[PDB]
Symmetry: C3
Subunit: 135 residues, 3 copies
């Protein structure tokens, strides 16, 4: 019956909420990060250039939320890649892989019917606050 | 190598299962709640009135499952809103927000191809059993 | 500020990765398992026979990943069943139920627009390493 830490993670380096959600919630040591679109943090608008540019921006936004929680991409344990078009799998994979210098997280990836704002990709993530042990 | 608590959460105040799943599982302090449709608990039928009425019922059902586990909406840390139609985002958001009097959970929301029973909305949730600390 | 265990789970009894992900990640006591298609572990090809055969293979693959982490299906706490066609719900349920001899996990199940490789079903899972307590 200990009181576990629960903290809302919020940074102006990631887009403002455009509905009733927080950017991320840290609870105990697990960080649940809200799905990120390829939105520019300053404007809230999707960046032009289609799925590859959107994917880069979405991952940049996750990176800023991780940083706010004292983490980096090495703390991610599970991610989800939602696509508007399954044909973009290869292209998104090549972007995604550049954000992990070490062992990849668990992952799910597939096509949904529609994302908010007509996005072409959304990235969701679960991280665990460090320190974490090595193999 | 402690033995962690794992408990099936079951209440007659939420719909009966219509396949091989439990309403929720508590494991350690985390509660994984099965996605709820706008089903009436007594009948198992979707409530009439479309997405807004379904969303209200789905959230009521989650509330009853949280209550069974000694929790309320303040214990939710992450939710997922699956829509049959992305155009219902605004309407569902206005329903959803009424269930959180405090800081919102992390969230994902988007359109899938089809839900069981022709539902227009499904709400999934992860909660952590209290006590939880405040900011 | 303890260092929590984080381990990549990898077994040749499940399919090789065909992108930048691990089969599963164990972190503390929670195991996040990447979504499994009905892929033959030796070939990486989808097994013939459609959704029922694919579902059996996907669940077999999850079973091998659980075994690698010292677990079995009784350790699963939450699963997700993604379908290419909602009409396959009954058939997939009858396969799925055969993998749980005890109380079912929490679950989500619904239709997405498309899965990798034209799969008809994907199964995702979260498990917790034992020992777990009984009711």
């Amino acid at each position: 019956m200990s009181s576990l830490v629960r903290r809302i993670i919020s940074t102006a380096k990631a887009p403002a909420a455009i509905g009733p959600y927080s950017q991320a919630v840290l609870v105990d040591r697990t960080i649940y990060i809200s799905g990120q679109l390829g939105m520019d943090p300053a404007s809230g608008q999707l960046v032009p250039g289609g799925v590859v540019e959107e994917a880069k921006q979405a991952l940049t936004n996750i990176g800023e939320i991780l940083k706010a929680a004292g983490c980096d991409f090495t703390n991610v344990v599970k991610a989800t890649v939602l696509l508007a078009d399954i044909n973009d799998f290869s292209a998104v994979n090549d972007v995604y892989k550049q954000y992990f210098q070490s062992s990849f997280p668990a992952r799910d990836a597939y096509q949904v019917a529609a994302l908010p704002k007509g996005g072409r990709v959304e990235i969701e993530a679960i991280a665990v606050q460090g320190p974490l042990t090595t193999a």
